[PDB]
Amino acid sequence: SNAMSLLARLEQSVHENGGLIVSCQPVPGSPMDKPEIVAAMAQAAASAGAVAVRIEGIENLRTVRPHLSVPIIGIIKRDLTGSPVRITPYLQDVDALAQAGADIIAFDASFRSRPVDIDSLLTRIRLHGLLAMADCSTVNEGISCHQKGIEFIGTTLSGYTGPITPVEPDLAMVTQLSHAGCRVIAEGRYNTPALAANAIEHGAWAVTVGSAITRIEHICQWFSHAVKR
């Protein structure tokens, strides 16, 4: 299938080029938050080592797609009244992402109150013949998604569903999931090359880096903080 051949080509690409995935999500409402600029970042990253990119939003994805040759992991972020889930919560979101050219669809796979169950989101992804990525927050969530046959298990939500976000990335989750057979994408707070290397060392198949590459305001804050005395 096109999905299996894409996975094979991505596995080859990670093996030959290194497992770097770049999330092209500027701060929303930022000067940088324009679809053409999102497109430019994605092209720049893909020219310089990114084996794939993550893109949020239909307008961004439609602008990016025609000018990008690597796989795109697509998400939609919503804010819901009754549920804390934001990442690709609806079947309609899956449909739109598929129609706009996502190669892989990522979605919140946490054990939290939500409008559509995980199995239904996954079925809808499979209906479009696309690969699925589970954005997880705990080992148990990751294992549960692995059991369903989901191709990519992300640590994306670890630290974003509990009481506080740790400073360091969740390397223990990477370690435990990868050694349980998951194809792990380490994601969340991998904001130095050393940390990204650390994820690979702990079993991650690839690492997604976001802020350190595509959020100028955040990078500036890091430096600004360092220089004040």
> By the criterion CB under 8 A, which residues form the site for a second copy?
17-20, 22, 26-27, 30-32, 34, 37, 39-41, 43-45, 47-50, 192-194, 196-197, 199-200, 206-207, 209, 212-214, 216-229
Q: How many CA atoms lie within 13 A of 47 on its CB side?
A: 7
CB of 119: closest distance to a second copy in angstroms? Answer: 32
d(CA 73, CA 185): 12
Give the number of other Cβ atoms within 10 Å of residue 83's Cβ.
Answer: 15
Q: What is the sign of the dihedral through the CA atoms of 4, 45, 38 and 64? A: negative
**Binding span for Cl ion by CB under 5 A among 42-50, 63-71, 72-80, 201-209:** 72-80
Tell me phi and psi for residue 33, to 5 degrees.
Answer: -85, 70
Q: Which of 34, 62, 65, 78 binds Cl ion (CB under 5 A)?
A: 78
Of 181, 188, 178, 183, the closest CA to residue 208 belongs to 188
- The kind and range of the H/E element at 121 are helix 118-127
Q: Which of residues 79-108 bind Cl ion (CB under 5 A)?
A: 79-80
**Binding span for Cl ion by CB under 5 A among 48-56, 71-79, 96-104, 197-205:** 71-79
Q: Which does 207 bind (CB under 5 to 8 A by kind): a second copy, Cl ion, none?
A: a second copy
Query: Of 149 and 225, which has the nearer Cβ to a second copy?
Result: 225
CA 223 to centroid of chain Cα atoms: 25
Q: Which does 200 bind (CB under 5 to 8 A by kind): Cl ion, a second copy, none?
A: a second copy
> What 8-state DSSP symbol labels residue 122?
H
Q: Which does 113 bind (CB under 5 to 8 A by kind): Cl ion, a second copy, none?
A: none
Number of H helices, E strands in the chain: 10, 8
CB of 187: closest distance to a second copy in angstroms? Answer: 13
Binding site for Cl ion (CB under 5 A): 78-80
